[PDB]
């Protein structure tokens, strides 16, 4: 039954269950025949190399609070970047990436920062 489920969930689709498909964020599996049994060749994503960064749940442009739509805030030390969770790619924190919620007073950990607005250059230019 477990085998069927694995075949059902792992082969037929990508299973969400942690450690169902093998250690790690599961990609996919290739079922293989065997005597009186089955063997699966799971393909799993495992993070290789890492780097520390300094984080804060938000940033204040105006004195208002910004949270990341997708990602977490980090900094190279000089500048703050927001990136995805499992593979590092920094991005310029713009309004396009961020969403509004509350003000600076409540936030815990929020840091002052500057958010880039793509609109301004269009009108001024």
């Amino acid at each position: 039954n477990l085998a069927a489920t694995k075949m059902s969930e792992c082969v037929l689709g990508q299973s969400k269950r942690v450690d169902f498909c093998g250690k790690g964020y599961h990609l996919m599996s290739f079922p293989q025949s065997a005597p009186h049994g089955v063997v699966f060749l799971h393909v799993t994503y495992v993070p290789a190399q890492e780097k520390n960064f300094t984080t804060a749940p938000a940033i204040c442009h105006d004195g208002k609070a910004h949270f990341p739509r997708e990602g977490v805030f980090v900094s190279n030390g000089t500048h703050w970047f927001v990136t995805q969770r499992n593979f590092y790619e920094p991005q310029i924190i713009t309004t396009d990436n961020t969403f509004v919620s509350g003000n600076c007073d409540v936030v815990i950990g929020i840091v002052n920062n500057t958010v880039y607005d793509p609109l301004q250059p269009e009108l001024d230019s």
């Binding site: 942690v18 799993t44 495992v46 993070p47 890492e50 984080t55 749940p57 949270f67 919620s101």
Partner: protein, 48 residues
Amino acid sequence: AGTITSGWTFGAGAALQIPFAMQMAYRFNGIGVTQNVLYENQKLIANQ
């Protein structure tokens, strides 16, 4: 220990330290409640 400091990542491979308050933002993200809920009521949630 890994659950507290690293989040879920410790299951996948190398555990990655992440501040706890951040984790709930993810965890709330897991349910369909955006991160803004947690921080906006961070103290209460912790107390609860």
